[PDB]
Amino acid sequence: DSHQLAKALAEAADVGAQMIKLVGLRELSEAERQLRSLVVALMQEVFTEFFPGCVVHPFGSSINSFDVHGCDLDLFLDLTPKEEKAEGAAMLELVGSILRGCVPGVYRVQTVPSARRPVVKFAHRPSGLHGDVSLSNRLALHNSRFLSLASELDGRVRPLVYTLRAWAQGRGLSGSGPLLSNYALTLLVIYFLQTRDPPVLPTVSQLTQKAGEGEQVEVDGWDCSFPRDASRLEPSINVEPLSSLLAQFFSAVSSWDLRGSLLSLREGQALPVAGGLPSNLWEGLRLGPLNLQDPFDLSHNVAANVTSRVAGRLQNCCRAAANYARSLQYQRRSSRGRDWGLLPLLQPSSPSSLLSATPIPLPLAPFTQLTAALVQVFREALGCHIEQSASWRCALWHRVWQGRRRARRRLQQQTKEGGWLATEAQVTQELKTEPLLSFVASVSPADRMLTVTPLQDPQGLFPDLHHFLQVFLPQAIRHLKLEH
Numbered sequence: 210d211s212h213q214l215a216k217a218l219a220e221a222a223d224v225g226a227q228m229i230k231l232v233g234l235r236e237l238s239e240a241e242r243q244l245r246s247l248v249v250a251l252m253q254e255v256f257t258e259f260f261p262g263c264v265v266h267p268f269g270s271s272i273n274s275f276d277v278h279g280c281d282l283d284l285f286l287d288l289t290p291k292e293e294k295a296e297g298a299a300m301l302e303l304v305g306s307i308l309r310g311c312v313p314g315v316y317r318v319q320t321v322p323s324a325r326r327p328v329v330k331f332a333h334r335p336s337g338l339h340g341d342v343s344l345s346n347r348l349a350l351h352n353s354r355f356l357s358l359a360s361e362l363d364g365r366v367r368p369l370v371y372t373l374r375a376w377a378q379g380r381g382l383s384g385s386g387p388l389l390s391n392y393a394l395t396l397l398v399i400y401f402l403q404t405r406d407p408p409v410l411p412t413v414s415q416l417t418q419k420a421g422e423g424e425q426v427e428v429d430g431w432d433c434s435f436p437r438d439a440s441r442l443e444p445s446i447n448v449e450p451l452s453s454l455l456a457q458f459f460s461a462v463s464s465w466d467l468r469g470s471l472l473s474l475r476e477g478q479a480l481p482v483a484g485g486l487p488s489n490l491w492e493g494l495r496l497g498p499l500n501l502q503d504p505f506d507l508s509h510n511v512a513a514n515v516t517s518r519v520a521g522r523l524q525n526c527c528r529a530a531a532n533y534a535r536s537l538q539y540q541r542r543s544s545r546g547r548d549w550g551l552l553p554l555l556q557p558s559s560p561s562s563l564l565s566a567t568p569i570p571l572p573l574a575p576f577t578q579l580t581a582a583l584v585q586v587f588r589e590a591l592g593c594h595i596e597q598s599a600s601w602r603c604a605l606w607h608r609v610w611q612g613r614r615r616a617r618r619r620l621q622q623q624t625k626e627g628g629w630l631a632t633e634a635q636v637t638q639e640l641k642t643e644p645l646l647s648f649v650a651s652v653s654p655a656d657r658m659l660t661v662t663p664l665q666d667p668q669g670l671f672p673d674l675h676h677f678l679q680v681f682l683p684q685a686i687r688h689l690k691l692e693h
């Protein structure tokens with residue numbers, strides 16, 4: 210791993226062959242599936258012992274065809290407001306207590322009633338496996354089946370999703386935090402494939418209408434109905450190759466307006482959020498930096514956890530990857546040994562790149578006034594020579610981001626023996642023609658956030674400046690808000 214993978218991807222043909230090979234290398238082996246089935250069987254046996262006539266249903270990564278090595282094993286267990294909440298919560302503990310002291314081999318057990326989808330976390334020691342036991346999310350079964358079906362509908366889906374998943378992991382865009390879940394990322398890829406000029410994938414609405422007899426099903430008041438076999442459905446007339454579709458993903462999602470759009474897998478379309486139209490129907494829908502609607506539960510934004518920082522970093526990383534995707538290094542192979550194609554996408558992010566990709570949250574303000582405020586803070590209060598979404602190129606000959614404490618101390622001392630912007634500029638002027646550090650500053654219309662990226666950095670002091678700006682700029686903007 211991390212060695213074999215690099216040389217395996219370097220060795221093979223074109224980018225598409227690399228994506229396919231990546232699928233081959235990351236997916237679970239037959240032994241891993243054997244192990245998983247065995248553990249599920251154990252779970253099934255003990256829970257049957259406690260709950261006669263109960264079924265343990267595997268779902269998620271394990272059955273949805275997007276499985277990779279080391280992925281979780283998710284299990285659904287199939288057997289007045291606060292009352293029902295707590296009844297539910299009590300049952301969970303029971304399940305927990307069964308996992309804790311009955312089924313042999315599982316040690317880490319933590320009940321999580323406080324989650325949106327209450328679950329009992331567990332780990333099985335001999336198999337090295339770990340996952341979730343969910344009392345009720347029945348939708349998960351169906352959306353898992355939907356993802357597997359999606360892979361079955363077109364052969365480009367799984368390579369695209371695998372490549373983009375590994376890439377997002379490498380860019381710090383996915384995980385269990387404010388980052389996108391793997392499910393949400395997959396949904397985003399599928400959404401992208403739905404919106405192509407010829408569509409690669411159909412909308413879930415279309416699937417729902419195709420459906421079939423006996424294939425009609427509703428769970429929690431939502432319609433989960435779709436055809437069970439891909440055989441009934443006509444192929445895609447979209448002829449685009451894998452490398453193309455990848456580049457198109459990067460470009461497209463880099464150019465989308467995320468805050469103004471609820472991306473709908475049902476309609477295969479972007480529903481304008483402002484104002485209130487998606488918010489009226491489907492009560493319970495959370496809107497924010499990134500809005501991505503579940504194919505079935507329509508009150509569910511699967512991206513609702515994503516902070517503005519993660520969304521901005523997402524579109525930035527996609528813009529960078531789109532620029533790389535236009536390069537000759539991407540498309541064509543290398544003669545001998547060089548990193549080409551998928552490899553720089555799958556390689557870790559540079560510290561300067563990782564830092565510059567994630568934007569800086571700024572106090573709310575009209576776009577025009579905000580831009581003017583920022584250029585004021587750069588022009589004066591900082592020694593920056595600046596010049597002309599919005600963007601500016603800035604040049605510094607000095608250490609201005611550091612040494613400010615001693616300088617202000619000395620100036621206030623001269624004030625002993627002897628309000629923002631210009632005052633702070635004093636602090637700048639007392640800190641002292643090839644620019645020491647030169648960088649770019651960008652502001653996107655919605656939501657307003659500043660992207661600072663390095664241009665000329667001889668001494669590698671850009672990150673210090675970036676942290677400094679992270680602290681200093683919201684402060685400056687803030688005081689410029691209160692001068693009105």
Ligand SMILES: O=c1ccn([C@@H]2O[C@H](COP(=O)(O)OP(=O)(O)OP(=O)(O)O)[C@@H](O)[C@H]2O)c(=O)[nH]1
Nearest residue numbers: 268269270280281349352353390391392393511
């Ligand atoms: O918002 C969500 C998230 C997850 N899920 C359901 O839970 C499952 C878990 O989705 P995950 O985001 O955990 O990804 P995954 O399991 O497919 O891959 P690993 O994280 O195991 O590497 C998904 O397959 C989906 O069915 C939802 O229904 N809604």
Ligand SMILES: [Cl-]
Nearest residue numbers: 404460461462
């Ligand atoms: Cl597009």
Ligand SMILES: [Mg+2]
Nearest residue numbers: 269270280281
């Ligand atoms: Mg998982």
